[PDB]
Amino acid sequence: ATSQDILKQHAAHYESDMGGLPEALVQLAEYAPETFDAYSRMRTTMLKSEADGAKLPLKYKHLILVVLDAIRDEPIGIVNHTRAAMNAGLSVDELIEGILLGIIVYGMPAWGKTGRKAVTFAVEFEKELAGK
Amino acid sequence: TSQDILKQHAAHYESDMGGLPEALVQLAEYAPETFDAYSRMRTTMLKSEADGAKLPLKYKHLILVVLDAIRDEPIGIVNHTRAAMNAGLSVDELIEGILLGIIVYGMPAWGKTGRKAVTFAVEFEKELAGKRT
Amino acid sequence: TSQDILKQHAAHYESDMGGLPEALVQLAEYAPETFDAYSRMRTTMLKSEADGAKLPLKYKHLILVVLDAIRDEPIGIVNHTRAAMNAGLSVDELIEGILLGIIVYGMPAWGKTGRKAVTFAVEFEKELAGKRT
Amino acid sequence: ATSQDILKQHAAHYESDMGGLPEALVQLAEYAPETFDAYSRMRTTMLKSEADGAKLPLKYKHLILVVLDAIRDEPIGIVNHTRAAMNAGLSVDELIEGILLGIIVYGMPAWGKTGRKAVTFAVEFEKELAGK
Amino acid sequence: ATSQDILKQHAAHYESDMGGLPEALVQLAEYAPETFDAYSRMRTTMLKSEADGAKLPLKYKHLILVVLDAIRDEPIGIVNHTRAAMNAGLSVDELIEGILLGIIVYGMPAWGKTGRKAVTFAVEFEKELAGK
Amino acid sequence: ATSQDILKQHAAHYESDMGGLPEALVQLAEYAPETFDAYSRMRTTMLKSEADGAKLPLKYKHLILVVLDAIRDEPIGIVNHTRAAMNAGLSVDELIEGILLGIIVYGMPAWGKTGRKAVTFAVEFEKELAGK
């Protein structure tokens, strides 16, 4: 696998799943293409859709990532995973219910620092989806 | 006392968790007003679909499983796995959810605590099948 | 609605914090039952000595300052510094408390967020002196 | 400062403050005496008593360390700092009030995993102190 | 089955690099063979030796992972990575100097809870390597 | 005052090792001069050069701190330590190989949030060092 081959190999996965290649992963491809390749393989199996044989719905896969990005304080990822979840059918109500659970294990900052940024995005994106 | 507050929330914990975890027993003893407010918060957060929740209870507990994986809380991770599976989560779904922790939190998201949920789940799946029609 | 639950806890937040932080405003909007239970928990935890608490309120908020230092919550760290100092904490005590984070959490316990509390405190000490006899 | 000199120099501080040299710090002295020296200097200023010019009471210094050790999941440290706090005048009621605050910022595990172990110890140590 | 093929595929890597497959990864291979495969590919490139074209010496790659396992409190990993680092030429002195640096960023617990366990192991393994 | 004496006392260390005193430590010196003193003593031994008797090369000491600053999300520190590592002989290739290892223990955010910022800096600083 050449690094051209690697970037092309994963293009459809990121476009489909995320609507694009996140900036972190662009830079990973740039400076660590073999790591990008292996990571992207892992990501592709982990985020497989139901149509492709997964048992956990894709909207709930990305909800889990939302919550994890809340905990880790990843405001870019959290919005990207919210968009992906909602594109896979997640409601804004489900999003909020999921994010709140983070308070049990990680305290009010699970909402207050980054988690709530997903909700702010969600209420605007919900309007856009409704317009489609 | 603590006795009345425990009585208030006993139905929630039996339904949701099959009982009150020891940490929360201790919290009830030493901080009964905190235990009461916390239990009220928990009760709303873990509301079932039948009581009007939008996110299925099995997935609520799966989120808690993954969070307990991250936090390295092995008692909680098994308690929430049990709860999730009681509410219909499959072992396959459990595994799929837990793996996602590796993306954000690395291999220890599986290796330290997450995998203990799976070890439990494989046995609990057979237990649950042997108790139900 | 959210309106009634906000009314319920407004006296607590004005007294304790000088108002409701934006994160909790948002929580009240989107999760009013969670905001209510959480506010009840907070109210007991941050009880004053006058209402029967044993740990002085200034030290309660100092603990929250140090925790916000660890967690890197800069809005919260200033809010709790303000609260602590309103309740009588000195800038010297603030600094002594914050430093202890370095033992358990390394130099970032000061360098990232903790020191922002001190920067604020030096100015707030003069503000508080200019508003009081 | 020889490594003999270093260990002797800090002996009174650890005996006074902690009732002993914690095992982690024994090993630090063993394998990293210059780091042990500098660290112990830092610790000695940070945990200075009121009699020696500190403004924050020693019992509340060690309470802050209790809470931090709850968060970090340091069950040895948490008991050592609880003992130190209580020896400096902290009540079991104050201890519990302080530990609970950890739930706000770090969730129920702030109590459930390690924090509550301080309380379990405290209720037994309180009996011992009362016996003195 | 497919697990057994994938285990075979990565056995050379783990044998060479670690001397075995840690239990966590044995379980991963069983329950999530496609994740184990991709992860192992990723690890294989990350931990490439100088002889295979790496620029960072293998002993220092494993030293970095020792320090990371100290921070994360991975006591099995920390020993596995210490053993790997020393088989790759790392001295005990180097090991201690690197682990200490954790204290700057993560406080005394970077030593006290798991990091120092690597030193305890190292001092014994050194005697083993010295016995030839 | 005593701050100014203690700053003078440690200036040689910081100038040599880091090329300056980070703002966080300037403030520490101002508000907590005795802590700054002891901390600086600790840092001075920890980051001793081979010429002064250290066994772990300075470039690798700073590489370890780069990785730790990636995990902790210290973007000022990560650049300061990258600069220090490269002034001590570390290559950009080595820097990237080490930062990637964070992903094993701490997930993609070990790269995505702060670690990759070191690479961005490094690639520019390399051009500077190459200009002599």
CATH code of the domain covering residue E53: 1.20.1290.10
Helix (H, G, I), strand (E, B) or coil at B50: coil
Any idea what the Cα angle at residue C128 is, between residues D68 and C47, rounded to 5°? 45
Residue A53 CB: number of other CB atoms within 10 A? 7
* Contact yes or no for D56 and C102 at CB 8 A: no
- How was this one solved? X-ray
Residue with token string 């990864």: E25
Alpha-carbon distance of C87 to C61, in angstroms, equals: 9
Instruction: List, as ranges, residues 54-93 from D with C-beta within 8 Å of E.
Output: 72-74, 77
Domain of A80 in residue numbering reads as 1-132
Query: Burial, F13: exposed, middle or buried (Cβ in 10 Å; 0-12, 13-18, 19+)?
Result: middle
Q: Is F46 on the interface with D (CB under 8 A)?
A: yes
* Contact yes or no for C41 and B45 at CB 8 A: no
CB neighbour list of residue A64: distance below 8 Å, 6 or more residues apart: B62, B63, B66, B97, B100
> Quick check: A76 and A46 in contact, CB under 8 A?
no
Q: Kindly report the nearest CA distance between residue E72 and chain D, in angstroms.
A: 11
Closest by CA to D45, choosing from D73, D17, D81, D78, is: D17
Q: DSSP states of C46-101 as a string?
A: T--TTTT-SS-HHHHHHHHHHHHHHHT-HHHHHHHHHHHHHTT--HHHHHHHHHHH
**Interface probe, candidates A71, A93, A114, A116, chain C, greatest C C-beta count within 10 A:** A116
Calculate the alpha carbon distances from A61 to A2, A10, B70, B109, F76 in Å.
Answer: 31, 19, 16, 15, 34
Residue E68 CB: number of other CB atoms within 10 A? 27
> Structure tokens of E48?
């490439």
Q: Is F103 on the interface with A (CB under 8 A)?
A: yes
Closest by CA to A61, choosing from A75, A74, A43, A73, is: A43
Query: CA-nearest residue of chain C to F26?
Result: C111
Q: How many CB pairs under 8 A join D and F?
A: 25
> Quick check: A88 and A120 in contact, CB under 8 A?
no
Query: Burial, D91: exposed, middle or buried (Cβ in 10 Å; 0-12, 13-18, 19+)?
Result: middle
CB neighbour list of residue D97: distance below 8 Å, 6 or more residues apart: C45, C53, C54, C55, C60
**Interface probe, candidates F67, F71, F99, F106, chain B, greatest B C-beta count within 10 A:** F106
Neighboring chain A residues of E39 at a CB cutoff of 8 Å: 38, 42
- For chain D, the domain total comes to 1
Query: Burial, B132: exposed, middle or buried (Cβ in 10 Å; 0-12, 13-18, 19+)?
Result: exposed
Alpha-carbon distance of D97 to D99, in angstroms, equals: 6
Q: How many CB pairs under 8 A join A and B?
A: 90
**Contacting partners of chain F (3+ CB pairs under 8 A):** A, B, C, D, E
**Contacting partners of chain C (3+ CB pairs under 8 A):** A, B, D, E, F
* Contact yes or no for E106 and C105 at CB 8 A: yes
CB neighbour list of residue C122: distance below 8 Å, 6 or more residues apart: C91
* Contact yes or no for B26 and D120 at CB 8 A: yes
User: How is residue F51 annotated by DSSP?
Assistant: G
Alpha-carbon distance of B90 to B15, in angstroms, equals: 19
> Structure tokens of A61?
């896969």
